[PDB]
Design a binder for this molecule. Structure first.
Ligand code: PLP
Ligand code: PLP
Lengths: 435, 435
């Protein structure tokens, strides 16, 4: 099978709606994807839907002969880490705890897939609430509902389909639980402090109303600290702090879905660290390669919780050992090279350029925004947005759409300022064409 | 981190309830796991919960220098196969279709994880039923329920938690849909043809009753062709053939969950091929490394089904590329070495030995059964069963429990008759001790 036959071969078995290239696995490197058909290089602001921290074939992994041996060792087989432990696994878990750990959240659980990471956070919360109810004389059949936001994306699995509400295509015709959903009071341009406070107070009102009309039945509140797929919607720290207080008042856990924001993209290990809100459970994935949850805070108040009792949470594999070994090495690079700090500084650079774009194209480049390297801007209509992405593609720059009118940037943590300049130059070239 | 410190390090972050060994990734081979602490060798009848087809470090993979290069290439990174295609991916898909494909089921979809494979089969069915309803003047809000069996195990995710019913520990305190569940008419010892027919007719009655009391609302019937976790319960081909007819009468899809039975364990690619029943959708995983579904038959009658319309099914990664590359090579070994046929012959050998065990220990070794290499027997009580497993462990043989009183054998497809003899000898030694 040859690069030029890839789309034909796949097309016999599956819907083939992806990018028009064939990935060269060997010649791709850093912030560049190589099309194996033409040899053309593509500037990567997409990073496998934000799942690549270092970009392709990072030198620290490719040149490391000892790591090669460890990776091969892991890659040849696929143990069930659920019941069979290894040195390779233990090294990963200890470096995860060191680099990404929170002392308040000591319980770690790993699984393949971001939606299932979120599901395990939910299951922890369902169990916690039922048992907390039981211990205080409340019916243990209560504690089965999930408070969540409009415009949320938490995945495409049985429980997360009841939470995700972006494109109808994702959720239509699939059975859902009737769980309480509230307005998302995200920052928008031309809203001052009092205006934002009023917006938040209304979501808070709706949240409080949900807790009071469904007594002892809401197990948790789940949120993205910054909504990704819904359109890079950012929230003030004040909103989540108010939600944190309200969750505690009604004995509900706070879960942050950091599958997209996590592992250094915003400039810290986790976006929540910048919002000064302490969650009870964090779900992670994408850049971490292996997915899962970190849990603690109020979780430990229920002694027979899901992390203390055998066989409550499980999967056959307990995550992919190859992913663990690769992630261990990635985390070591992040720590050794100070990549979180690099994300803060280069994020400030990218944001500044998007502000300049807004100044030069004020009716077209709307609402430039970001935290660290997680940046975006919007266009007047979805047609403009879709056209801009096509024009960037022709110029060999890969970016992703979000929501109705957003273009999002997801560069690797190792992106250089020259590479950011190249992406901005491509946007400047394309804009007169779309107008 | 040293082998003797593995359990200590992991114990700081997670519940450590697995096997008492530390896996030596390099020295393990074939039907033997090596404990890195002692160097003791363990006879493997467990195969990472039936997910390993060839056992550890098979020579055809370890000695193949070209494959090493391909595997390393895939292992260094983790592309989103959902939107970025590669030669490595296309080679996998084409060899999967060749070795495991069914001409009636041309639609292939891949995902990480067995439960999510089953969930995607369900989602295909929900969409199919709603749209089939709509096209025949029936309310498209109908078609949201799943007919399933008692003692079923389909996973631990949002939708499969509503199906799985083995140990209460797996499902307790998690929100479920109220879906119709019927008795499982599995073969048991000392039941003749008429007795079995009577048992099946009763399950059939219950199935028919479910279809009639929930009109147009049952999207599919899902089953394991042989129930694994529930206790290796086998069904006559007559039962599923009757279910096949009944599904067609009420316009519902038939889904086989072949995550445990699949990829050659029973002697054919899929267990369903031996039962002479044609499903509409098959979910697969474990031995396949990448998980997913094959779909066709009645699925294609709805033109805008989930395999024809973009973005209805998805995950970020679209399965693990390292898993695909390893699976491609495994499938090539299976095909080149005739491993399906090897499973039939060695399965007959194993079964014969378990019959001899039943003859020598008639009050203790109960209900010897199996299809190909998927074999089991039961003990009088769960205490006897648990003790037998402890006694086998002391003798360095790894087997798994199932249900209340079953011991299951899950050898690799490459198991030799001498290795089967060794496992049987260990059982013979242990039995007088348990009695
Ligand atoms: C994409 C993502 C998920 C789902 O992860 P998958 O691996 O595709 O299942 C969940 N939450 C957020 C915020 C995500 O970005
Ligand atoms: C174990 C298994 C699954 C679940 O697979 P996971 O990878 O653990 O999610 C589903 N169905 C059957 C029959 C299984 O054996």
């Amino acid at each position: 099978t040859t690069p030029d036959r890839v789309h034909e071969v796949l097309g016999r078995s599956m819907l083939v709606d992806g990018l028009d290239i064939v990935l060269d696995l060997t010649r791709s490197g850093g912030s560049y994807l190589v099309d194996a058909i033409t040899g053309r290089r593509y500037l990567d602001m997409f990073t496998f839907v934000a799942s690549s921290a270092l970009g392709m074939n990072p030198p620290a992994l490719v040149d490391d002969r000892e790591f090669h041996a460890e990776l091969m060792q892991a890659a040849l087989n696929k143990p069930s880490n659920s019941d069979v432990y290894s040195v390779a696994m233990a090294r990963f878990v200890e470096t995860f705890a060191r680099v990404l750990g929170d002392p308040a959240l000591p319980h770690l659980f790993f699984v393949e897939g971001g939606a299932l990471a979120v599901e395990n956070a939910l299951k922890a919360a369902f169990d916690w609430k039922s048992r907390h109810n039981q211990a205080h004389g409340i019916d243990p059949a209560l504690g089965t509902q999930v408070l969540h936001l409009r415009g949320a994306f938490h995945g495409r699995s049985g429980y997360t389909l009841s939470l995700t509400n972006t494109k109808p295509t994702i959720t239509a015709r699939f059975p859902k639980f009737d769980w309480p959903r509230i307005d998302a009071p995200y920052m928008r341009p031309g809203l001052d402090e009092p205006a934002m406070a009023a917006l938040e107070a209304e979501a808070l009102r709706q949240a409080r109303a949900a807790f009071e009309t469904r007594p002892h039945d809401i197990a948790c509140f789940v949120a993205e600290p910054i909504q990704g797929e819904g359109g890079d919607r950012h929230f003030r720290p004040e909103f989540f702090a108010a939600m944190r207080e309200l969750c505690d008042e009604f004995d509900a856990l706070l879960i942050f879905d950091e599958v997209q924001t996590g592992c250094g993209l915003t400039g810290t290990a986790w976006a929540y660290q910048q919002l000064d809100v302490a969650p009870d459970i964090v779900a992670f994935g994408k850049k971490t390669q292996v997915c899962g949850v970190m849990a603690g805070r109020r979780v430990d108040e229920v002694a027979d919780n899901v992390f203390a009792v055998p066989s409550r949470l499980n999967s056959s594999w307990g995550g992919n050992l190859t992913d663990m070994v690769r992630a261990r090495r990635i985390l070591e690079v992040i720590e050794a090279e100070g990549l979180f700090e690099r994300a803060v500084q280069h994020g400030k650079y990218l944001r500044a350029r998007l502000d300049e774009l807004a100044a030069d194209f004020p009716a077209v480049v709307l609402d430039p925004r970001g935290r660290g390297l997680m940046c975006a801007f919007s266009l007047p209509t979805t047609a403009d947005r879709d056209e801009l992405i096509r024009q960037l593609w022709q110029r060999a720059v890969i970016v992703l759409p979000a929501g109705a009118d957003t273009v999002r940037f997801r560069p690797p943590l190792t992106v250089s300022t020259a590479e950011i300049d190249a992406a901005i130059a491509a946007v400047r070239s394309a804009l007169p064409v779309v107008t």
